[PDB]
């Protein structure tokens, strides 16, 4: 029973790797040899956001590149303004342990997650003037890890029990459930078209999920350790992944294998969060040895080094116009770099 | 630019109100001392503290508030989570201490408890956190030694060659055999904790019972030890 199944599975994975090795005509770095290098990129701390009490676990920009949500472990969710350093909202959370936060594309809602496996949506209309819990979602068994808004009606969440859901906010139930992963799903990265997404789990395998169909299309097994954060390329045809083995990797949805690997011998620390830039030439990586590396996505060389944090860079975001890059670390400071 | 001056005055007023609220919350946050309660499923870790003021239950976690000598304590019991714990433990680096509760009465589980204590102790983010150790169900160890065969000497060949430490003081009304077993468990955990030798955090061993009141005062005293050792480190005295 189990041995003919596992032998069939192994012959299928040998067919898949024969496919993947036939497809590999050449490498990206050979192609990109006659490409002008980026050079030294110097970015400076334009603003420093303060007033958080505990460590800043996750944060997410707005779609107008103006207001950022920051999420902390003290039980406070602070909606900031990036231009004038004004706290436009501060929300007290029910559970103190928070692991993710999401901001709606229209700006009407903020979502937060954490260890109490409940996604809490807060409305920002404030017809009375006070922020209130708009809804709570308690479907998942394991902890809630990263959650992102497709729109104001449907939110996609990544639990800790290897299951991703698609919630409808109006019904308050789970529309579509994704259960293909075996390791703990850490974060998800939505497509710019919002038809697909990718999830990186702890089993060193990124999956490509269709929201409407309800099943994975592709599996990527290029890493060696826990895939921490995942981010799409701005055209929606590629993604980058950061793991604990100090190697970033770039993957293709069409070639179904890794194009390039971003690795340096001097740094052996893990990779917390990666965001591309607007153009897609700079890959920004929040390393665990207290700084950010600006890798070149086409040349695999560090442009420059954002060593402004005192503790580990917990999360990294880039605005939709590419104007500034915000990093939150575990010293409770949010640096805006330009 | 008059309208933008009006908008900036309104945003500044909102920012002043929020900033004041955050200062009050900063005071309340700093007064609070966090404690992570970790233990295996065999052990009665819930039965450890009986001086709890309240026992509030969230969906996937349990929170306990108690105060000792006007000092507020939050104790977070991890509830319904997956068996793999290497990703949600990173949240708990900010706590003052980790209370670790182990059942001595069953012997097979003890080896797993020793591996879990090793993995706690050698973790990168749990280096700054002290760990406070409870060796629960000592009365059961007493009752279970008089069973014709010793399990611990089977599961551990070192315990055929072991003597009671001279620094250790046995309680009156006890069997030297039972105290040998107690201190040999204690020594296993202290050899795991001394093996690393970082000097940033220490391991406080305590022999507790099934029904006992003194546990909150013990955790208070070990908190005083942790913050005194932390300030001694901080002025580079030790």
């Amino acid at each position: 029973e189990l041995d003919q199944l596992r032998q069939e599975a192994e012959q299928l994975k040998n067919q898949i790797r024969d496919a993947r090795k036939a497809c590999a005509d050449a490498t990206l770095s050979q192609i990109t040899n006659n490409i002008d290098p980026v050079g030294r990129i110097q970015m400076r701390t334009r603003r420093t956001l303060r007033g958080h009490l505990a460590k800043i676990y996750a944060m997410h920009w707005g779609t107008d590149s103006r207001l950022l949500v920051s999420a902390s472990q003290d039980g406070k969710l602070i909606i900031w303004d990036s231009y004038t350093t004004n706290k436009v909202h501060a929300i007290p959370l029910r559970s103190s342990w928070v692991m993710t936060c999401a901001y709606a594309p229209s700006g009407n809602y903020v979502a937060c997650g954490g260890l109490d496996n409940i996604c809490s949506i807060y409305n920002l209309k404030t017809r009375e003037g006070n922020v209130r819990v708009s809804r709570e979602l308690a479907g998942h068994t394991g902890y809630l890890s990263c959650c992102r808004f497709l729109d104001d009606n449907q939110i996609v969440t990544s639990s800790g029990d290897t299951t991703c859901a698609l919630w409808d906010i109006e019904t308050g139930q789970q529309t579509t459930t994704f259960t293909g992963h075996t390791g703990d799903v850490m974060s998800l990265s939505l497509a710019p078209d919002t038809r697909l997404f990718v999830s990186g789990a702890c089993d060193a395998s990124a999956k490509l999920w269709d929201v409407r169909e309800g099943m994975c299309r592709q599996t990527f097994t290029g890493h060696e350790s826990d895939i921490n954060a995942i981010c799409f390329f701005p055209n929606g045809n590629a993604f980058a992944t950061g793991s604990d083995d100090a190697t970033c990797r770039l993957f293709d949805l069409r070639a179904d294998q890794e194009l390039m690997t971003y690795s340096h011998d001097n740094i052996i620390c893990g990779i917390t969060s990666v965001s591309f830039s607007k153009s897609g030439r700079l890959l920004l990586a929040g390393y665990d040895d207290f700084n950010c590396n600006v890798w070149d996505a086409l040349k695999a060389d560090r442009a420059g080094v954002l060593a402004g944090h005192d503790n580990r860079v917990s999360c990294l975001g880039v605005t939709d116009d590419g104007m500034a890059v915000a990093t939150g670390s575990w010293d409770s400071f949010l640096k805006i770099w330009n | 630019t008059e309208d933008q001056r009006n908008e900036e005055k309104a945003q500044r007023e909102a920012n002043k109100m929020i900033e004041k609220q955050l200062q009050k919350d900063k005071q309340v946050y700093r007064a609070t001392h966090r404690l992570l309660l970790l233990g295996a499923d065999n052990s009665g870790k819930s039965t450890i503290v009986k001086q709890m003021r309240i026992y509030h239950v969230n969906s996937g976690i349990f929170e306990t508030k108690f105060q000792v000598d006007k000092v507020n304590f939050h104790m977070f019991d991890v509830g319904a989570q997956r068996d793999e714990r290497r990703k949600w433990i990173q949240c708990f680096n900010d706590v003052t201490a980790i209370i670790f509760v182990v059942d001595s009465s069953d012997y097979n589980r003890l080896q797993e408890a020793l591996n879990d204590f090793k993995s706690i102790w050698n973790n990168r983010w749990l280096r700054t956190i002290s760990v406070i150790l409870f060796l629960n169900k000592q009365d059961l160890l007493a009752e279970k030694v008089l069973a014709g065969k010793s399990k611990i000497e089977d599961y551990f060949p070192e315990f055929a060659r072991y003597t009671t430490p001279e620094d250790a003081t046995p309680e009156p009304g006890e069997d030297p055999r039972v105290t040998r077993a107690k201190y040999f468990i204690r020594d296993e955990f202290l050899r795991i904790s001394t093996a690393s030798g970082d000097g940033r955090h220490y391991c406080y061993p305590h022999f507790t019972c099934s029904v006992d009141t003194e546990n909150a005062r013990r955790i208070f005293n070990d908190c005083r030890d942790i913050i005194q050792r932390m300030h001694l480190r901080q002025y580079e005295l030790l």
Partner: nanobody
Amino acid sequence: QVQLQESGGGLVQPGGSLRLSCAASGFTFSNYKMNWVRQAPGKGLEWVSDISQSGASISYTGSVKGRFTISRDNAKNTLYLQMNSLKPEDTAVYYCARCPAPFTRDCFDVTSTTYAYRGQGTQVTVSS
């Protein structure tokens, strides 16, 4: 792709010898601490023994200590376990396990609910 392949095992006799070969494919072998983990019939997983990156530090489980040799070759990229003085009560499935992070000394791999850095394991039966 991280993949592990155990080899050797089977129906043996008490007091005999057996070598378990483990082949680690799909990663750099010298960076990771690695270890052996077994599963009795109708019981849970238990940590047999461990070995670090360089191979200097080696510890065992108490109740079978002094009975198993753990050799890692980095160049051959193989993990051997030498099993002499076998006992009929110690009949189980043996899984190679790998600690998930490189250059570290902390391991969380006793999980039974689909830990995905282990091999399929080998059945090792002792008949007296």
